Design a binder for this molecule. Structure first.
Ligand SMILES: CN[C@H](C)Cc1ccc(O)cc1
Ligand SMILES: CN[C@H](C)Cc1ccc(O)cc1
Lengths: 602, 602
């Protein structure tokens, strides 16, 4: 369709499209009301005219207005103003896509339940297509997916898959050992996911019994091996281990580098070491877009290592924690769904308006990481993160649709609840996601353009912060960026030129955070808002040491402070990719930071 | 406030309040838009006037309209017309509360994330109050709760609690054995939940280490005992066992009676037997409002048995699966939150309009079951079932707020995600639930009146079906109700007077189901819609045998057919409590069933 205008797909930083939203919103409500009325048009309304003007009705409507006025007062006092175009530089939140908002309220009037096709065929059919759209977003050939309440639960479902997968070889030896005849025991704990899947689908009349002897029964949960995750992982991963049965003790942190990506050398050291101890690797977790720094694990290097390890008989499951960055992969896909060759990226992105100044914006490392996702077994992807779809809407994609038989209980599921971890599920959530995917195709013609704006906006912010120097009363405060962003997240810290006190810097940034958040003051009057996170040795190691030293801090300070406090901005506003529009908000960020620093002294 | 009018709280069976909904809906949107604009009123709109009338904008808005028109076409073709006043007699679906609908779309414009207070203080504060409102709904003295994506996941969180609770005594023996000095091993596996909780909160500096040696680590998951559930349980319970680590093999079905409630005799036989084998009881699941029959387990009898078993040193955790019936408990609570004495119920219910003909509507058995919930450790309750709150919104209540320390990771949580099973969570869901609880108090002055209408509507349907006899061309088809409803669910079957063929009846009811569902025809033209379920010996035993014989079927037929097919109606319409309004739809149900039977022959 040539090239769509992202500015028509948001209510707006200043409600510029408020009328458009209301008109479409009310049109949709009207179509629903009309649908209600003409189901059984012969039925007369149960609520009479006299009822609707009676006093009982009025006092109830007034009580309802009272409640909504209190809800409105509370929302309008404390909610976060991240709809702003260039003043909110923090958490993974901006506006959400108007078509999703519209479709959600529309779908909610029907209130269909997607756990069961009978309850809502249309939103049920819609969720199946969303699953296939997740798969093609991941270049899965014959893959699948479904909407999940959120990323954490999708991650848990990742472990549910992996845990059950590693247990299936042992369970084949117990029910139909012919499938795994002549296989060692350690060979069974290192079968590639596909061999396990080909074997299970081979034993049609025995699938039920093999699954009955699987990790579903409760047996062999420590036998199935260690779960490896980046040391900077999201706590949902701990929670996932805990809940799924392998437990916290079967979770091994793989160290990260100075770019805060899984050190593939130490990943190799850990996997090979465990293999010498005959300890199986349940799976490895690669994060494409880490929570605290927006880093992209080299997924290619992770899957190539699995390829170089299978010669030594070592196979690990790979699940990609793309809760945040999953939708980003649409920037690499052309309208035929082919991964754009890297050398053609800057051209295609210019052709499609994905990026508006033609330079390199995406590493080939980050590029390569995203392509390799198609080889992982499963992916967590949050529509309510970089899908710009409203909470609550997470996702999971599986490389092979058959894999869902490892988890099923008893093509379009008649009871999708039998193929997923959770239960009841809003068909409105599926309509909300389907609407976004069908207004914005999951490639450069749609989401690519929105992801590109995110990244470009993050890049202008990186170049603004670099060199940002403020003069705060004899003191000169200087801004330093953490690493060049692998995605759209820009971490940064403020430091006094001279102060070699790292706990004093951490207290400086903890003070700018306080003045740039709900802590100090009214959020509705905050001229600049950000988030903050702590890099502590227990979880980050000395991964920040190169950075702490770049700033002039000693290895002793680093150990004395034991952590570094950094401000993060997951730059999700779509309005800042235009240099000129960013230039409007640059002086308003420096000015807001100037009094926030001046306030931290005096 | 005297007595509120349920008819103002729904868009309506025929959109009678459509205008009211749109006006409030648009008022709310306008307040949000105004809030956006006056965050930083000095900022000029980023989207220019020229942009909003440009051609790029128009084609994108048109593409968006195209997508919504396809969403609308699909929704209006296949969605279920359960908004109708008295024609939908099936699944747990009617209208949802307008204030919830309104609050949800309002909250969604802010799109706050409740996993973290910073992301949305107002909806975060709202969810805390919802938790306390869940607790007081359960008469928990100093209890707690939170919204859960759905019932299944709340059930899973129930097992997460129980699994971790039974493991804590063993873990105290490993980290601070003083707490459990002189305690046998089997005594440790039978400590009452409160003793475990008092001991954990006693060891302040060791809480972290005890939890590190708990079931969170992965150890002792088969040591902690068997999970007992009604044989007619929801598959989420199987799924819960599977996922949580104890596995399918640690799940013991307790037989049910002819009223399809947990046979407390056989519950006692199972628990005492396991105790003679020194096998601990992880917990028992009591269902208040079963999925397929709306039966209410005698929770009082379950907790009194626990009281009579602790003398023999046998303690079991009790979790109440009230996904469906949980909100029903509001019918028993007066405006000071005291459980209404049973002998005063029919008076108070008449006083408050909870019931409109003054007779017994609620057994003292069902009454007693509901009161006993206050002694259970935790409860699953679905706002999106009998809360009339839109999907997706489940719930969990815990008897003792401290219990959440058994599950926490690292008063108003600053990171509610550290106190719950799931992760990201729509603040809009909390606003939606808070709005309902604050328009309708969780007692006879609010939800009681809505639950009462449900039950009364179900009672008129029971008396209609009883005696419903149709003449279908020389054949005379007769309707038989399954059991008197413990709540608002009415099961029933159609039988040929004469046919002693039970598989032939099951095929008759499977044919009425086909004509009364999306199977045969357009759902939008179906004059009567219902659900259907199969009572199969593997899961129901001979619990339906008394019923199968009441209808004239042999114990041989029952074993020959191996199941009975029953139609279920979870009567959730609020419009049918008025005998006169039910009388309008009685002839339209018989007439719709008359041609649906006539169509099944010929
Ligand atoms: C069969 N009843 C299940 C347990 C929950 C559910 C499913 C579909 C619905 O439309 C409504 C409720
Ligand atoms: C810290 N980021 C977590 C992992 C997810 C999240 C939390 C709050 C938000 O407002 C948005 C996203």
């Amino acid at each position: 369709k040539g090239e769509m205008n992202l500015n028509a797909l948001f209510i707006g930083d200043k409600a510029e499209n408020g009328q458009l939203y209301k008109d479409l919103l009310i049109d949709l409500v009207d179509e629903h009301l009309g649908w209600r009325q003409n189901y059984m048009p012969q039925d007369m309304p149960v609520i009479s005219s006299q009822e609707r003007t009676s006093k009982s009705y009025e006092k109830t409507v007034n009580h309802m207005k009272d409640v909504l006025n209190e809800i409105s007062s509370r929302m309008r006092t404390h909610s976060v103003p991240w709809h702003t175009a260039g003043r909110y530089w923090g958490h993974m939140n901006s506006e959400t896509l108007m078509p999703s908002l519209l479709a959600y309220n529309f779908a909610m009037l029907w209130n269909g339940n997607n756990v069961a096709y009978e309850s809502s065929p249309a939103t049920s059919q819609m969720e199946e297509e969303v699953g296939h759209e997740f798969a093609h977003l991941m270049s899965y050939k014959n893959g699948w997916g479904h909407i999940v309440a959120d990323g954490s639960l999708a991650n848990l479902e990742g472990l549910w898959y992996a845990r059950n997968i590693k247990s299936l070889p042992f369970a084949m030896k117990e029910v139909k050992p012919e499938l795994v005849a002549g296989k060692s025991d350690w060979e069974l704990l290192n079968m590639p996911t596909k061999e396990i899947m080909d074997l299970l689908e081979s034993a049609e009349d025995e699938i039920d019994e093999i699954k009955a002897h699987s990790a579903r029964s409760g047996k062999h949960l420590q036998a199935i091996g260690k779960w490896l995750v980046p040391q900077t992982k999201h706590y949902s991963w701990l929670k996932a281990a805990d809940i799924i049965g392998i437990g916290l003790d079967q979770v091994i942190p793989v160290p990260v580098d100075h770019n805060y990506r899984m050190d593939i050398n130490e990943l190799e050291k850990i996997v090979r070491g465990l293999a010498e101890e005959q300890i199986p690797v349940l799976g490895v977790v690669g994060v494409v877009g880490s929570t605290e720094e927006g880093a992209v694990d080299s997924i290619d290097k992770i899957i190539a290592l699995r390829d170089e390890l299978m010669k030594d008989g070592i196979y690990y499951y790979v699940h990609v924690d793309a809760a945040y960055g999953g939708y980003g992969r649409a920037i690499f896909l052309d309208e035929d769904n082919n991964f754009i060759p890297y050398e053609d990226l800057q051209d295609v992105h210019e052709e499609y308006g994905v990026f508006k100044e033609k330079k390199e914006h995406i590493s080939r490392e980050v590029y390569d990481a995203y392509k390799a996702i198609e080889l992982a077994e499963s992916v967590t992807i949050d529509p309510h993160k970089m899908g710009y779809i409203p909470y609550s809407a997470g996702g999971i994609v599986i490389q092979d649709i058959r894999m869902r038989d490892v988890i099923s209980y008893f093509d379009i599921p008649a009871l999708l609840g039998a193929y997923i971890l959770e239960g009841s599920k809003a068909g409105a959530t599926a309509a909300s996601v389907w609407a976004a995917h069908h207004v914005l195709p999951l490639n450069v013609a749609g989401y690519g353009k929105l992801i590109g704006a995110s990244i470009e906006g993050s890049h202008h912010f990186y170049n603004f912060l670099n060199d940002l120097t403020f003069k705060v009363g004899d003191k000169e405060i200087e801004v330093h960026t953490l690493t060049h962003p692998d995605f759209n997240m820009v971490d940064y810290v403020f430091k006094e030129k001279g102060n070699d006190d790292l706990v004093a810097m951490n207290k400086l940034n903890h003070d700018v955070y306080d003045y740039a958040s709900y802590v100090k003051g009214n959020i509705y009057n905050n001229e600049f808002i950000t988030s903050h996170t702590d890099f502590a040795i227990p979880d980050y190691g000395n991964s920040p040491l190169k950075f702490v030293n770049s700033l002039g801090f000693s290895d002793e300070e680093w150990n004395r402070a034991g952590k570094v406090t950094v401000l993060r901005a997951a730059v999700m506003t779509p309005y800042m990719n235009d240099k000129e529009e960013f230039d409007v908000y640059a002086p308003k960020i420096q000015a807001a930071l100037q009094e926030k620093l001046e306030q931290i002294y005096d």
